[PDB]
Design a protein around this motif. Structure first.
Motif, PDB file in Angstrom:
ATOM      1  N   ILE A  20       0.731  -1.282  -0.042  1.00  0.00           N
ATOM      2  CA  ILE A  20       0.099   0.118  -0.070  1.00  0.00           C
ATOM      3  C   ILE A  20       0.684   1.264   0.121  1.00  0.00           C
ATOM      4  CG2 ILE A  20      -0.397   0.519   2.455  1.00  0.00           C
ATOM      5  CD1 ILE A  20      -3.093  -0.027  -0.290  1.00  0.00           C
ATOM      6  N   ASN A  21       2.065   1.212   0.330  1.00  0.00           N
ATOM      7  CA  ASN A  21       2.868   2.521   0.244  1.00  0.00           C
ATOM      8  C   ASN A  21       3.098   2.890  -1.107  1.00  0.00           C
ATOM      9  OD1 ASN A  21       4.141   0.082   2.515  1.00  0.00           O
ATOM     10  ND2 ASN A  21       3.782   2.107   3.371  1.00  0.00           N
ATOM     11  N   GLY A  22       2.522   3.911  -1.462  1.00  0.00           N
ATOM     12  CA  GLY A  22       2.655   4.343  -2.873  1.00  0.00           C
ATOM     13  C   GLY A  22       1.879   3.755  -3.830  1.00  0.00           C
ATOM     14  N   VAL A  23       0.825   4.537  -4.331  1.00  0.00           N
ATOM     15  CA  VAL A  23      -0.376   3.857  -5.272  1.00  0.00           C
ATOM     16  C   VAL A  23      -0.873   5.282  -6.072  1.00  0.00           C
ATOM     17  CG1 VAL A  23      -1.978   3.731  -3.729  1.00  0.00           C
ATOM     18  CG2 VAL A  23      -2.264   2.261  -5.758  1.00  0.00           C
ATOM     19  N   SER A  24      -1.265   5.134  -7.332  1.00  0.00           N
ATOM     20  CA  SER A  24      -1.751   6.356  -8.047  1.00  0.00           C
ATOM     21  C   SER A  24      -3.088   6.166  -7.421  1.00  0.00           C
ATOM     22  CB  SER A  24      -1.682   5.972  -9.631  1.00  0.00           C
ATOM     23  OG  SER A  24      -2.489   6.888 -10.219  1.00  0.00           O
ATOM     24  N   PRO A  25      -3.712   7.321  -7.526  1.00  0.00           N
ATOM     25  CA  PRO A  25      -5.179   7.628  -6.882  1.00  0.00           C
ATOM     26  C   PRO A  25      -6.272   6.987  -7.896  1.00  0.00           C
ATOM     27  CG  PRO A  25      -4.506   9.848  -7.622  1.00  0.00           C
ATOM     28  CD  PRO A  25      -3.145   8.712  -7.898  1.00  0.00           C
ATOM     29  N   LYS A  26      -6.052   7.126  -9.039  1.00  0.00           N
ATOM     30  CA  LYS A  26      -7.132   6.178  -9.885  1.00  0.00           C
ATOM     31  C   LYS A  26      -6.876   4.818  -9.765  1.00  0.00           C
ATOM     32  CE  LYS A  26      -7.825   7.993 -14.007  1.00  0.00           C
ATOM     33  NZ  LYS A  26      -7.962   8.416 -15.495  1.00  0.00           N
ATOM     34  N   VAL A  27      -5.601   4.208  -9.630  1.00  0.00           N
ATOM     35  CA  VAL A  27      -5.631   2.637  -9.264  1.00  0.00           C
ATOM     36  C   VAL A  27      -5.935   2.452  -7.772  1.00  0.00           C
ATOM     37  CG1 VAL A  27      -4.084   1.023  -9.438  1.00  0.00           C
ATOM     38  CG2 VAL A  27      -3.453   2.965 -10.774  1.00  0.00           C
ATOM     39  N   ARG A  28      -5.653   3.275  -7.006  1.00  0.00           N
ATOM     40  CA  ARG A  28      -6.400   3.290  -5.479  1.00  0.00           C
ATOM     41  C   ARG A  28      -7.702   3.136  -5.512  1.00  0.00           C
ATOM     42  NH1 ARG A  28      -3.743   7.240  -1.295  1.00  0.00           N
ATOM     43  NH2 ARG A  28      -4.427   8.506  -3.082  1.00  0.00           N
ATOM     44  N   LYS A  29      -8.214   3.947  -6.132  1.00  0.00           N
ATOM     45  CA  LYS A  29      -9.869   4.100  -6.242  1.00  0.00           C
ATOM     46  C   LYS A  29     -10.397   2.718  -6.767  1.00  0.00           C
ATOM     47  CE  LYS A  29     -13.877   5.802  -5.798  1.00  0.00           C
ATOM     48  NZ  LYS A  29     -14.401   5.878  -4.301  1.00  0.00           N
ATOM     49  N   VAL A  30      -9.939   1.870  -7.902  1.00  0.00           N
ATOM     50  CA  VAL A  30     -10.324   0.816  -8.319  1.00  0.00           C
ATOM     51  C   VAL A  30     -10.236  -0.314  -7.424  1.00  0.00           C
ATOM     52  CG1 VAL A  30     -10.161  -0.737  -9.998  1.00  0.00           C
ATOM     53  CG2 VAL A  30      -9.819   1.591 -10.331  1.00  0.00           C
ATOM     54  N   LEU A  31      -8.817  -0.219  -6.635  1.00  0.00           N
ATOM     55  CA  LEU A  31      -8.740  -1.474  -5.672  1.00  0.00           C
ATOM     56  C   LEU A  31      -9.544  -1.401  -4.428  1.00  0.00           C
ATOM     57  CD1 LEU A  31      -4.716  -1.511  -5.740  1.00  0.00           C
ATOM     58  CD2 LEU A  31      -6.130  -3.017  -6.290  1.00  0.00           C
ATOM     59  N   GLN A  32      -9.910  -0.262  -3.914  1.00  0.00           N
ATOM     60  CA  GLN A  32     -10.971  -0.253  -2.732  1.00  0.00           C
ATOM     61  C   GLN A  32     -12.409  -0.337  -3.349  1.00  0.00           C
ATOM     62  OE1 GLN A  32     -10.002   3.672  -1.251  1.00  0.00           O
ATOM     63  NE2 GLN A  32     -11.287   4.614  -2.513  1.00  0.00           N
ATOM     64  N   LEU A  33     -12.639  -0.408  -4.787  1.00  0.00           N
ATOM     65  CA  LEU A  33     -13.904  -0.587  -5.375  1.00  0.00           C
ATOM     66  C   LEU A  33     -14.184  -2.113  -5.483  1.00  0.00           C
ATOM     67  CD1 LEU A  33     -15.072   1.948  -7.886  1.00  0.00           C
ATOM     68  CD2 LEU A  33     -15.591   1.789  -5.445  1.00  0.00           C
ATOM     69  N   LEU A  34     -13.023  -2.836  -5.472  1.00  0.00           N
ATOM     70  CA  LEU A  34     -12.914  -4.452  -5.662  1.00  0.00           C
ATOM     71  C   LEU A  34     -12.912  -4.925  -4.167  1.00  0.00           C
ATOM     72  CD1 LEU A  34     -10.628  -4.762  -8.532  1.00  0.00           C
ATOM     73  CD2 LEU A  34     -12.982  -5.340  -8.547  1.00  0.00           C
ATOM     74  N   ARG A  35     -12.858  -4.044  -3.135  1.00  0.00           N
ATOM     75  CA  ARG A  35     -12.874  -4.536  -1.653  1.00  0.00           C
ATOM     76  C   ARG A  35     -11.608  -5.229  -1.382  1.00  0.00           C
ATOM     77  NH1 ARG A  35     -17.939  -7.884   0.057  1.00  0.00           N
ATOM     78  NH2 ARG A  35     -17.136  -9.373  -1.547  1.00  0.00           N
ATOM     79  N   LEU A  36     -10.607  -4.874  -2.040  1.00  0.00           N
ATOM     80  CA  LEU A  36      -9.145  -5.550  -1.677  1.00  0.00           C
ATOM     81  C   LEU A  36      -8.373  -4.359  -1.316  1.00  0.00           C
ATOM     82  CD1 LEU A  36      -8.578  -7.315  -4.955  1.00  0.00           C
ATOM     83  CD2 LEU A  36      -9.301  -8.200  -2.874  1.00  0.00           C
ATOM     84  N   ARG A  37      -8.157  -4.031  -0.071  1.00  0.00           N
ATOM     85  CA  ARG A  37      -7.699  -3.120   0.971  1.00  0.00           C
ATOM     86  C   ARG A  37      -6.414  -3.499   1.585  1.00  0.00           C
ATOM     87  NH1 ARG A  37     -10.738   1.539   1.989  1.00  0.00           N
ATOM     88  NH2 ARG A  37     -12.779   1.164   1.321  1.00  0.00           N
ATOM     89  N   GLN A  38      -6.232  -4.732   1.778  1.00  0.00           N
ATOM     90  CA  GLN A  38      -4.961  -5.504   2.249  1.00  0.00           C
ATOM     91  C   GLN A  38      -4.377  -6.145   1.379  1.00  0.00           C
ATOM     92  OE1 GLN A  38      -5.764  -7.868   5.730  1.00  0.00           O
ATOM     93  NE2 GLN A  38      -6.371  -6.025   7.088  1.00  0.00           N
ATOM     94  N   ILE A  39      -2.861  -6.279   1.363  1.00  0.00           N
ATOM     95  CA  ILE A  39      -2.343  -7.355   0.630  1.00  0.00           C
ATOM     96  C   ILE A  39      -2.666  -8.777   0.872  1.00  0.00           C
ATOM     97  CG2 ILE A  39      -0.261  -7.878   2.251  1.00  0.00           C
ATOM     98  CD1 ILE A  39       1.477  -7.654  -0.027  1.00  0.00           C
ATOM     99  N   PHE A  40      -2.849  -9.689  -0.149  1.00  0.00           N
ATOM    100  CA  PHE A  40      -3.013 -10.965   0.002  1.00  0.00           C
ATOM    101  C   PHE A  40      -4.564 -11.118   0.178  1.00  0.00           C
ATOM    102  CE2 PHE A  40       1.391 -11.768   1.174  1.00  0.00           C
ATOM    103  CZ  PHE A  40       2.111 -12.032  -0.225  1.00  0.00           C
ATOM    104  N   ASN A  41      -5.428 -10.134  -0.125  1.00  0.00           N
ATOM    105  CA  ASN A  41      -6.867 -10.180  -0.113  1.00  0.00           C
ATOM    106  C   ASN A  41      -7.282 -10.799  -1.191  1.00  0.00           C
ATOM    107  OD1 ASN A  41      -6.883  -9.311   2.584  1.00  0.00           O
ATOM    108  ND2 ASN A  41      -8.132  -7.371   2.079  1.00  0.00           N
ATOM    109  N   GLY A  42      -8.478 -11.468  -1.153  1.00  0.00           N
ATOM    110  CA  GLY A  42      -9.281 -11.978  -2.164  1.00  0.00           C
ATOM    111  C   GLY A  42     -10.943 -11.934  -2.243  1.00  0.00           C
ATOM    112  N   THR A  43     -11.436 -11.872  -3.693  1.00  0.00           N
ATOM    113  CA  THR A  43     -12.578 -11.598  -3.835  1.00  0.00           C
ATOM    114  C   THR A  43     -13.219 -12.038  -5.167  1.00  0.00           C
ATOM    115  OG1 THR A  43     -14.473  -9.955  -3.889  1.00  0.00           O
ATOM    116  CG2 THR A  43     -12.453  -9.201  -4.851  1.00  0.00           C
TER     117      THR A  43
END
Lengths: 216, 51, 225, 128, 124, 62, 109
Positions: free
Chosen positions: C75-98
């Motif tokens: 999570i240390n360093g991510v583009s805000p557009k890429v970060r927005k998609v990652l929280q829209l997929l419910r993937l906030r931690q590393i090694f999370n799955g959906t």
RNA sequence: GCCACGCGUCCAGCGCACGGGGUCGGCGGCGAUGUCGGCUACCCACCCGACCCGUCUUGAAACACGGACCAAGGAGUCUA
RNA sequence: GGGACGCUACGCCGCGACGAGUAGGAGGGCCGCUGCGGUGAGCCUUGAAGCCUAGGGCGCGGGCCCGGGUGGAGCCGCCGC
């Protein structure tokens, strides 16, 4: 009222029956078996008669008392536990004592006791080891076996017989049972050449000897 | 509640899925029957090689 | 008194005693039918290809409808557009799955987060160890373990999802209520991959882990779970 | 032969060493009592490796075993005889401790009243 | 009333003491010696109180009447019980349960009486 | 590492009135029982408004 | 009459390059130099025998100057026959490069 | 192999347990003038880590400034 | 038609999620000092305050209570100010 039959379905895998319940229904023949539907005691007194109450109220109450604990299911007392045994440990094999005061002694295994300890007994003439209990974990199991299938172990000796009572002096019952069992074993170990010298010897590790490298 | 693994704890799987009993009632009779036929094929193989 | 009321107490608990036993029979029969559905779906894919090769032509299989998406980077360093998609997929931690269904909208959201995720099409098996071992339901916005079938049926009972097998069938086979079934599941808290990783920072095509590993995600699922 | 408590739980402590002040060893004017550093370049403040640890909320003891003596009781400061009868319904959980300024002849008033009430005393034979 | 006077005595009362992360009250009728709404001996209209006897042998049971609520000289009546251990606990149980007199503290009086009788027992 | 914001994870609202008077508190104690034991929202509006400040519960003219 | 334990050297603690974790000890048992030969020693009880100044008691004997720190062999370490062990109390660093004993009575054979 | 048990009319108790978080209804020793235990706090030895605080600064361990040591005092107070 | 605990409701109990930090802001202090109004039928020359301490301890922490020595005349706990 009637005689009970054993479980009709044999156990296939632990927790799993071999026959399904509808096949069990036909095997049970339940298709044709439909079914439809203390403390006060009077006592004479020499007046009149008195009615005493058993389990009278306690005269003492502590200042505070513990709450009761929740109910578990899988915890059993030690007497009701299942007792495992190694496949290498068979009646007639030769064991090596490691932790007891008989270190390095090659002691002959007799039978598996009730509590899980091993009744192990080398001849007292050779090993100077009596009818003695020994835990199975602290045992080196050597792949050297004699045939004790035809011996008669006394039934009166058990775990309670070897239980510590309360200076230890040898009772005369111990001496009689010592020669009662050794008289059946000692002729049999003489049939195998150089076996009595093997039992009189002590086990030890020398230079260049590794237990993981060698087999026994 | 302590989440017991349904894959290791057989009864937790049975609490969640009652059909798992007959999932594992089969694949034991079937695998033993298939292992029996493998042995009998090898048993009949020794008669074919020797004759 | 207490004559009729005590017997009514016996008939009160007897109402749910027969109803619970009737519900157990329904859950048993639902899973038996679901076992039949996988004979029918798994064998016909081989059956379609076998007769196409006999006729000389080719059988193109159906493009997969569901893929399992795992976040593999930190999570240390991510583009805000890429970060927005990652929280829209419910993937906030590393090694999370959906679980994510496939369409034009989902593909383009997965393309914009390709270095940060590793995804692919799971097997029928790989659903089972995820739902059974790491399956956690979101009931009243709380992460509650699915230790009983009534927990799913309390929230998903209106969609005829009343047991663990109904949820698995709704996830694996992408039904009309996949959105409610997938959003009920908490994001899967997977452990670190046993055996190590090839390379985090590159695509799976160029010897790494990121991107789309189509059917090789089942190997990675076994080490995460 | 002492006064046992009702239960004897296992006392666990996450840390037992005292939280010393930064650079308390280097100076005498700097006492052992902890002061949180607030410097811009302070190594302890920004959690450098191999430095003095700072007290956090994670070092808190368990609520079941908090303020409990190693014998299994919890202390209570007692000044006179009248304060002893409070604890006779708290006999198996709480113990009594005599204050420092209590005279020797008033200490030998207290001890036996707690012995009649079976109340454990941390310092029964103080002066004699 | 009981709830109105409790909100005043809960912090600013002379019988309350606080030290060593504990709170206690030294009221004459506060059995269990804890600052609480149920166990406050002065707050409630009906109060049960257990105290040691004047001569050291037996227990005195404090009974509060409902007639003279603002008449503290008459509101309290004291009965002394100097019987055996089982019979003493039977009487205090009977005065509370069978009179329906503030019944949530019946066992608390039993616990207090069982220790006061133990306190006056000859010491080993 | 979790990419969530703790900026507004603590909701700001009154749990109990800042007044130290005991007659309001006994009325608050009465309506806490009514809110969590009855199904009416009226006991949820009254209990919410009993916590409120003087400027939040303006006088109502006749 | 002879030795009943295998010779092992306390090489050091389980560590990184700039961080050591002295709650887990690394053992170099004599004679084992591969991972697949460490399976026999798994679960065996290890002890570090040392002597001190003040006399302490001895089970079944007159009180002596020797003392021990008991432990067990947990799992294999590395590839070249190393192995991890865990003791009740952490081993002192004076024992670095010294001989410790691993016994056989936790036997699985 | 089977989560299938009745009739006629119309179109329930007993025990077992992969079951709502550990128990033993299991044991062995030594303990009065030389033994047991005592996290912390007294001293010493070893491994790993580890540059002296405050402040200005984008940047301080700095060859940037104050600073031998210790005790006391010592700096957001009052009115409108 | 005859029975365990509880509930200082500003109390107790159960679920989940989270825990970095300069300037800066807020909350809780049964953290600490001094004096005043109440309160402890409070402590005290059979030893107060202060000081020293290789002891026993408690609290994450600010700090606090006992054990020992010195000391000779005052001192502290709780509720508010």
């Amino acid at each position: 009222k009637g005689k009970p039959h054993c479980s009709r379905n044999p156990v296939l895998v632990r927790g799993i029956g071999r026959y399904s319940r509808s096949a069990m229904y036909s095997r049970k023949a339940l298709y044709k078996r439909k079914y439809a539907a203390l403390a006060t005691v009077t006592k004479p007194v020499g007046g009149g008669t008195r009615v005493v109450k058993l389990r009278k109220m306690p005269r003492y109450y502590p200042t505070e008392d513990v709450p009761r604990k929740l109910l578990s299911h899988g915890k059993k007392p030690f007497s009701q536990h299942v007792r495992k045994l190694r496949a290498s440990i068979t009646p007639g094999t030769i064991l090596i004592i490691l932790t007891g005061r008989h270190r390095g002694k090659r002691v002959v295994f007799l039978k598996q006791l009730s509590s899980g300890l091993l009744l192990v007994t080398g001849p007292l003439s050779l090993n100077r080891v009596p009818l003695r209990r020994t835990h199975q974990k602290f045992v080196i199991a050597t792949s050297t076996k004699i045939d004790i299938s035809g011996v008669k172990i006394p039934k009166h000796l058990t775990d309670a017989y070897f239980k510590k009572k309360k200076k230890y002096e040898i009772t005369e019952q111990r001496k009689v049972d010592q020669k009662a069992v050794d008289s059946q074993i000692l002729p049999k170990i003489k049939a195998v050449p150089q076996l009595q010298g093997y039992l009189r010897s002590v086990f030890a590790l020398t230079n260049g000897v590794y237990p993981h490298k060698l087999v026994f | 509640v302590l989440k017991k693994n349904p894959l290791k704890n057989l009864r937790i799987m049975l609490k969640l899925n009652p059909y798992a009993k007959t999932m594992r009632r089969n694949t034991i009779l079937r695998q033993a029957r298939n292992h029996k036929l493998r042995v009998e094929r090898a048993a009949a193989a020794l008669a074919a090689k020797s004759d | 008194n207490f004559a009729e009321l005590k017997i009514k107490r016996l008939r009160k608990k007897f109402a749910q005693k027969m109803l619970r036993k009737a519900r157990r029979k329904l859950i048993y029969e639902k899973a038996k039918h679901y076992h039949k559905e996988y004979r029918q779906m798994y064998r016909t894919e081989i059956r379609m290809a076998r007769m196409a090769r006999k006729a000389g032509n080719f059988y193109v299989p159906a493009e997969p409808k569901l893929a399992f998406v795992i976040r593999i980077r930190g999570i240390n360093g991510v583009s805000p557009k890429v970060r927005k998609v990652l929280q829209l997929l419910r993937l906030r931690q590393i090694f999370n799955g959906t679980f994510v269904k496939l369409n034009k909208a989902s593909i383009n959201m997965l393309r914009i987060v390709e270095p940060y995720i590793a995804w692919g099409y799971p097997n029928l098996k790989s659903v089972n160890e995820l739902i059974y071992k790491r399956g956690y339901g979101k009931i009243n916005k709380k992460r509650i373990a699915l230790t009983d079938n009534t927990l799913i049926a309390r929230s998903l009972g209106k969609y005829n999802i009343i047991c663990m097998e109904d949820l698995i069938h709704e996830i694996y086979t992408v039904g009309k209520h996949f959105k409610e079934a997938n959003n009920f599941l908490w994001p899967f808290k997977l452990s670190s991959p046993r055996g190590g990783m090839k390379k985090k920072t590159t695509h799976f095509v160029e010897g790494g882990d990121a991107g789309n590993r189509e059917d090789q995600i089942n190997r990675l699922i076994r080490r995460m779970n | 032969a002492a006064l046992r408590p009702l239960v004897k739980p296992k006392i666990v402590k996450k840390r037992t060493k005292k939280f010393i002040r930064h650079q308390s060893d280097r100076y005498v004017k700097i006492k052992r009592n902890w002061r949180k550093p607030r410097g811009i370049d302070n190594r302890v403040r920004r959690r450098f490796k191999g430095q003095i640890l700072m007290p956090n909320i994670g070092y808190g003891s368990n609520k079941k075993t908090k303020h409990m003596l190693p014998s299994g009781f919890r202390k209570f400061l007692v000044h006179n005889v009248k304060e002893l009868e409070v604890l006779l319904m708290c006999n198996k959980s709480y113990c009594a401790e005599i204050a420092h300024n209590v005279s020797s002849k008033n200490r030998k008033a207290i001890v036996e009243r707690a012995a009649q009430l079976a109340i454990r005393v941390t310092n029964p034979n103080a002066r004699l | 009333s009981a709830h109105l006077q409790w909100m005043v005595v809960r912090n600013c009362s002379s019988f309350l003491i606080k030290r060593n992360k504990q709170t206690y009250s030294t009221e004459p009728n506060n059995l269990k010696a804890r600052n609480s709404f149920r166990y406050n001996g002065l707050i409630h209209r009906k109060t049960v109180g257990v105290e040691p006897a004047a001569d050291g042998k037996g227990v005195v049971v404090v009974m509060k009447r409902r007639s003279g609520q603002r008449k503290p000289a008459t509101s309290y009546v004291r009965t002394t019980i100097n019987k055996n251990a089982r019979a003493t606990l039977s009487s205090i149980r009977h005065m509370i349960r069978k009179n329906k007199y503030h019944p949530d503290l019946r066992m608390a009086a039993i616990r207090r009486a069982s220790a006061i009788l133990r306190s006056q027992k000859p010491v080993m | 590492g979790v990419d969530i914001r703790h900026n507004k994870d603590r909701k700001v609202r009154r749990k109990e009135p800042k007044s130290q008077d005991i007659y309001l508190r006994l009325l608050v104690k009465l309506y806490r029982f009514l809110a969590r034991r009855t199904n009416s929202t009226f006991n949820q509006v009254v209990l919410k408004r009993l916590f409120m400040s003087r400027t939040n519960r303006p006088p109502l003219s006749l | 009459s002879g030795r009943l334990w295998c010779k092992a050297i306390f090489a050091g603690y389980k560590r990184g390059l700039r961080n050591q974790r002295e709650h887990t000890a690394l053992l170099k048992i004599e004679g084992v130099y591969a991972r697949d030969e460490t399976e026999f020693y798994l679960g065996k009880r290890c002890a570090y025998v040392y002597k001190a100044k003040n006399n302490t008691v001895t089970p079944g004997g007159k009180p002596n100057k020797t003392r021990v720190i008991w432990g067990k062999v947990t799992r294999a370490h590395g590839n070249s026959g190393m192995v991890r062990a865990k003791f009740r109390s952490n081993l002192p660093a004076k024992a670095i490069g010294h001989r410790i004993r691993v016994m056989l009575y936790p036997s699985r054979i």
